[PDB]
């Protein structure tokens, strides 16, 4: 065991809830109770660290650093008549004076302030924003006042502090190309800006109420050992929540777990989340920045007057979703991009989801209940040349199954399908059939 483990299992009917899967040696085990909630844990908010730079300097200009309203660290430059005045204006000297005054302003008790490069670094002391200003000579090239957010790229200060956030959004962009960036500690004058999660925002799921994975490790003695334990869920990295948003599946619960393509599938009520192509525990883009067919998808065309799906079966190029109420196909001509997949809501046939529906080949069988019999139905394609229709096998023997169905198995080298009833479980239904040419030349049960 592990932690979380008698925990995902508290349950009273198995049969109902726990639904298994595999994949390789992996076991994913899923529990239908349980609500997915996010962490509680935030990234830190908008900070109230600024830092300021100079770029040009000009001639013969007062520079003011307007700190949350009274006027602070004043300097002003010669008239540049005389050939001395070119010293001045340089970043460095520009800086260095604008530090000097600042330290000695009354205020700086309250501010931590350094000089690296050409930057000014002011951090405050459980404070919120400075709400700089920082006047100067030309509209903003002189001086260059940012506390999380920049209005373009050329505009990035050569220095910065390791670990800066920064907010990119320039004017009259689409909201899609907005990211954050943060400085790391680099060499060189220039540094360098990488992508990183926002400011303020829910890191990723809470995995004591994501599915669970049972893997079996190694065999000791001809005796393999498995453990439980808790899913390597991929934790969200890049972008801020409009970009990269939560998949609608929090705070709802799970229906079905199953994959296409390559690609998990976390299938809860209305929402159907795609899983990166060959990395089944990541849902979320790996660069915010430019978009790739790999990344994962979401696809909700599913009615919402359909409830939570429950099985998924694969036919003849398409994948099926069965739920309780109706039917969608989800293509696989095209792969699947953002812009590509869509469920297409089918067929409208009742279908009992209590048991498994099973594929024999070329058709899916499923079982119905109704009043204390049932019947079983054949799902193939028609000769309509793409278009599915539903059958009854067991038209001339209906009341033959008592009770319901709970169990199914088939086998197509055989052509045999065994069915199970609650009413007398010492008795077990095989249904034979044999297909020859284009008509069923046998469709037995005993």
């Known amino acids: 065991?592990?932690?979380?483990?008698?925990?995902?299992?508290?349950?009273?009917?198995?049969?109902?809830?726990?639904?298994?899967?595999?994949?390789?040696?992996?076991?994913?085990?899923?529990?239908?109770?349980?609500?997915?909630?996010?962490?509680?844990?935030?990234?830190?908010?908008?900070?109230?660290?600024?830092?300021?730079?100079?770029?040009?300097?000009?001639?013969?200009?007062?520079?003011?650093?307007?700190?949350?309203?009274?006027?602070?660290?004043?300097?002003?430059?010669?008239?540049?008549?005389?050939?001395?005045?070119?010293?001045?204006?340089?970043?460095?000297?520009?800086?260095?004076?604008?530090?000097?005054?600042?330290?000695?302003?009354?205020?700086?008790?309250?501010?931590?302030?350094?000089?690296?490069?050409?930057?000014?670094?002011?951090?405050?002391?459980?404070?919120?924003?400075?709400?700089?200003?920082?006047?100067?000579?030309?509209?903003?090239?002189?001086?260059?006042?940012?506390?999380?957010?920049?209005?373009?790229?050329?505009?990035?200060?050569?220095?910065?502090?390791?670990?800066?956030?920064?907010?990119?959004?320039?004017?009259?962009?689409?909201?899609?190309?907005?990211?954050?960036?943060?400085?790391?500690?680099?060499?060189?004058?220039?540094?360098?800006?990488?992508?990183?999660?926002?400011?303020?925002?829910?890191?990723?799921?809470d995995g004591s109420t994501m599915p669970y994975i049972i893997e079996r490790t190694n065999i000791v003695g001809g005796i393999a050992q498995f453990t439980i334990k808790q899913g390597y869920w991929d934790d969200r990295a890049v972008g801020d929540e409009l970009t990269n948003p939560m998949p609608s599946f929090v705070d709802q619960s799970l229906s079905d777990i199953f994959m296409v393509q390559n690609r998990l599938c976390l299938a809860a009520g209305e929402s159907c989340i795609m899983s990166r192509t060959s990395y089944f525990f990541q849902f979320f883009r790996q660069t915010v920045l430019s978009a790739v067919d790999t990344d994962p998808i979401d696809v909700f065309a599913d009615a919402s007057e359909v409830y939570a799906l429950k099985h998924a079966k694969v036919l003849d190029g398409d994948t099926v979703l069965f739920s309780d109420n109706a039917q969608f196909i989800l293509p696989g001509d095209k792969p699947l991009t953002k812009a590509t997949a869509l469920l297409r809501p089918t067929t409208t046939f009742e279908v009992d989801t209590n048991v498994a529906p099973v594929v024999t080949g070329e058709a899916v069988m499923f079982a119905t209940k109704d009043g204390a019999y049932s019947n079983i139905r054949e799902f193939y394609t028609d000769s309509y040349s793409d278009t599915k229709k539903a059958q009854p096998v067991t038209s001339h023997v209906n009341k033959l199954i008592r009770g319901g169905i709970y169990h199914m198995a088939s086998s197509t080298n055989f052509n045999r399908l065994f069915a199970l009833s609650e009413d007398n479980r010492s008795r077990v239904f095989v249904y034979d059939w044999l297909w020859q040419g284009t008509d069923k030349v046998q469709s037995a049960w005993h």
């Open 1 to 205: 065991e592990t932690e979380g483990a008698a925990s995902y299992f508290n349950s009273n009917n198995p049969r109902v809830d726990y639904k298994f899967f595999t994949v390789g040696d992996t076991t994913f085990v899923v529990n239908r109770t349980k609500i997915v909630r996010a962490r509680a844990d935030k990234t830190p908010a908008v900070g109230g660290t600024a830092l300021v730079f100079s770029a040009y300097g000009q001639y013969g200009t007062n520079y003011q650093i307007i700190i949350n309203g009274v006027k602070a660290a004043e300097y002003k430059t010669a008239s540049g008549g005389s050939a001395s005045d070119v010293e001045t204006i340089r970043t460095e000297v520009i800086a260095e004076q604008l530090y000097t005054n600042l330290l000695t302003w009354a205020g700086a008790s309250d501010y931590s302030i350094s000089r690296m490069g050409t930057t000014i670094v002011i951090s405050s002391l459980s404070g919120a924003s400075f709400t700089v200003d920082t006047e100067d000579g030309s509209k903003g090239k002189d001086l260059v006042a940012i506390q999380y957010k920049v209005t373009s790229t050329d505009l990035l200060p050569s220095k910065a502090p390791v670990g800066y956030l920064v907010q990119v959004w320039p004017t009259g962009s689409k909201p899609e190309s907005r990211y954050w960036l943060k400085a790391e500690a680099a060499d060189g004058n220039l540094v360098t800006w990488q992508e990183t999660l926002g400011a303020d925002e829910v890191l990723g799921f």
